[PDB]
Design a protein around this ligand. Structure first.
Ligand code: CA
Ligand code: CA
Ligand code: CA
Ligand code: CA
Ligand code: CA
Ligand code: CA
Ligand code: CA
Ligand code: CA
Ligand code: CA
Ligand code: CA
Ligand code: CA
Ligand code: CA
Lengths: 285, 285, 285, 285
């Protein structure tokens, strides 16, 4: 029962027809906030992990250690909480590293992850090179007897086109991927078509706030037939805007000016104070 | 010149009479935002580090590794950037650990840190036990020939009173602390009096947004005579409020709805994209 | 089946009468060597972790992060391998930290750990203060529905005597500890008596190579009735002697001089080369 | 003066004609032992770091985090100690990562490092691709105003031949590398010739204990004209042999049997006990 996110996510995917909405989180505060609000699944972003943990742009700076550490932290805030889908980029190396990444994610209670066809160093590797990554990942999840949900992501739309994306996804499905992710749709028509081309194999829609793809609402994605929808930049973007506006006020007016109900104790409560108090009180000292 | 934050902070303290304003930062995004806005010094919070890196409340959960890792990351985002003052709590153990903490902070380019009299396990240790911590810290900075600014913090006001705080600060000053921090003033009158009681030794004012102490503006603190003013919760609080409001919108309306100018590229730029592009372009491949 | 060390160790303890021999390991090489030789359980030492990962003496320098990272690494080298018992010292703080430590160890596949009565800063805490630690640990293992084996260690012999040790162990057993560890026996007679005083509750014997306690062989400990025997310094000590002798030869003779069969490939094989080759080959690229 | 390893190594290289002997170390114990014996420079191995910290073979499993953490630990055991040369492999990614690696190594007090032409995923990249790595590294050391010693390593001998190695080294020298390393000489004649072909630019000889290259003594390497000689596997190999023999004795005879003078206190002394005692005693509590 505890640390069973993979099993939980797989249940949502196989035993329900609901659109699994996963807000993009990147640290403990953002994750705890999504938990407070009752989201049924969370998504740990690579760009957010990089920006927050390393203060760097999303240019393959975060490696396995950074990603696993952030995912291990987020997925286990509540041992009985919502499953976590995490970006696994290209696996951080050759097949040995892809396998290591999947094993570490599995061990860390991560529910699933997306693995792409980009070069590790928008360019994609050959179809065969991509399948080497998928194969390594699937073999690992099978060897570990895990319900881990492997999402096959293809970034080939821009450079190779729609047909190539569909063929790559079909090939990934044959290799054992559980869900497909065609990144960067140019239109809503194209998004609905990818779903129909791969049906009944489930697809995941990646919504990038203020990105280059069209706006698709949760209701629209559900009607299109997607099974999972992740929200990249959903928390990093508003956090930045708020931090910036507040700091400008401090710089120019000499006061922080945050609404008074956002107290240190409220933040501690969002971050697990009650669980800590129960441990402390239960211990009798 | 690079990694010289301690020297820079010491210059501001000794060669100027300005009030050094340090917004409380807790991750790469918050730190990069403060940098973008031109703050002359930053403050890394313990509560924020704990909430963001660990998703936990501020109950002595973050230890040396967590604190040093976050401080090392923040202080070095720009090798030629603003100095970083970091919370060092009680030093994470006995004198061996206090010394290790100071050494690690120094090695990591941290400019200064505050060390308190709280129990490690509001209660404070004896005056002598506190001085053991200060002594260990000062000896370390001296052995390493560093300009590190050691701030002696006392949390004794609530349980022991004002006089005790003043005597503890005077004792810490004699042991080699560079700045004093009387935590949790109950009034503005009391804040101005502490400054006068320790003059000309410099004091630091810790402003806790939405906390239990009275509101003191930057102009007021400057007139009171404080030399440094740190802003606890200045970025963690508004980040939470914004993340929460956005996620409620996603949950109930199906859209994130973040102002359109907060794009992934703008976030990357705030997080060092230009520096990365210069490295990439300069390398010729 | 994978990551089931706790269940495996508990099976050995409850379903067999064998003396579980656990060599003290401290890094990947020492652990892989014990695995190569077929040991049924391993013991991760605190002194060894500190010396190897931090290059420091055993003076409460390693904290939770260091210990969990080394244990997570060792326990999972083989997902289907031998259980790992790890030192957990005093839990690295108050009950909140004791609980965090147990939870992290459990999550990391650690099979069991020893928790002591020493001060965290040979002195021991009060009986009640020690029971607060045991209580926190037991409650955590129960909340997580884990088979984790909690070993209650008492370091009270020197300062308080034998009777006090026995009463502390009995109290720990009542609080839920699974095994007792009376550290530092002064004689073999005393060791056999502790076993008889706590029978049928199982005891663990800690053999410290070149330490201050008398030499007890595996056969002797088994006859005395101990159920687990750990070997502190079993690998760190000979590694040091060998490294020293080799480096003296390099310094004075200009050659390393290591027996020729200890090749880089043999070391890689000990360290999992075959598993890596199977992943690489299976991936098809 | 403290944390000045780069300056110290550069002094040995530029102001002396001595052969700088660097034993390969991989953890705190091995490094502390080399320090105890008075070695003037140390070499942190990649294979050893991987085996010890990760328990894995040398197959690009250790990434920047692992390498920097081990190097940061080793180089700073004594702030006034011997310089550390560390393996930096291929820089762990494209130029952005090469630069990040050099910056992190510099910040961590590392004195120098070797950067190679191998593929990151014996094969080498094109000459131009290799120079991109060297360029990124050199630009970083210059931007940081560091004395860091960059060693250009070429693994091209096997697949491309001697001439190609010499041309790659000459090109690397023009880009700013400080020392060259032609890896894997097939004979002593070839080693002396490489030195003469690049004279007066200094070369480093990598001695791999029980490897595939011929045995060259320190006296011989000095006469050949090499300026630095590193000893890969010098400590990992004998540690393994000793750990194995000891564990076989424990398994088959029930006793560890380590010479009695290798006591826990002696190991603590090798690992910095005296420094810790001075901190503890000096603090007055
Ligand atoms: Ca990514
Ligand atoms: Ca639940
Ligand atoms: Ca307010
Ligand atoms: Ca604090
Ligand atoms: Ca500047
Ligand atoms: Ca928008
Ligand atoms: Ca211990
Ligand atoms: Ca097995
Ligand atoms: Ca040999
Ligand atoms: Ca290497
Ligand atoms: Ca010296
Ligand atoms: Ca012995």
């Amino acid at each position: 029962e505890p640390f069973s996110g993979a099993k939980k996510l797989r249940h949502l995917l196989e035993n329900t027809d609901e659109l699994i909405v996963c807000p993009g989180v990147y640290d403990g505060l953002s994750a705890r906030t999504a938990m407070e609000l009752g989201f049924k699944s969370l998504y740990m972003t690579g760009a957010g992990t990089t920006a927050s943990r390393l203060g760097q742009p999303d240019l393959a700076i975060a490696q396995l250690h950074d990603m696993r550490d952030n995912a291990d932290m987020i997925a286990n805030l509540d041992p009985f909480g919502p499953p976590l889908i995490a970006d696994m980029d290209t696996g951080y190396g050759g097949p040995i590293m892809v396998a290591r990444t999947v094993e570490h994610y599995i061990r860390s209670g991560v529910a699933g992850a997306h693995l792409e066809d980009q070069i590790l160093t928008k360019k994609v590797v050959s179809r065969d090179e991509y399948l080497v990554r998928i194969r390594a990942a699937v073999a690992t999840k099978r060897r570990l007897r895990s319900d881990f949900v492997l999402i096959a992501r293809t970034d080939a739309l821009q450079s190779l086109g729609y047909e190539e994306c569909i063929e790559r996804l079909r090939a990934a499905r044959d290799e054992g991927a559980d869900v497909g992710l065609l990144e960067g749709f140019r239109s809503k028509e194209q998004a609905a078509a990818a779903v129909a081309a791969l049906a009944p194999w489930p697809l995941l829609l990646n919504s990038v706030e203020n990105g280059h793809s069209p706006l698709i609402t949760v209701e629209e994605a559900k009607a299109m037939g997607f099974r999972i929808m992740i929200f990249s930049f959903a928390t990093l973007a508003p956090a930045y805007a708020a931090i910036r506006e507040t700091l400008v006020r401090l710089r120019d007016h000499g006061v922080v000016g945050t609404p008074d109900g956002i107290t240190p104790v409220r933040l501690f409560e969002v971050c697990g104070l009650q669980d800590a108090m129960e441990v402390d009180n239960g211990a009798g000292g």
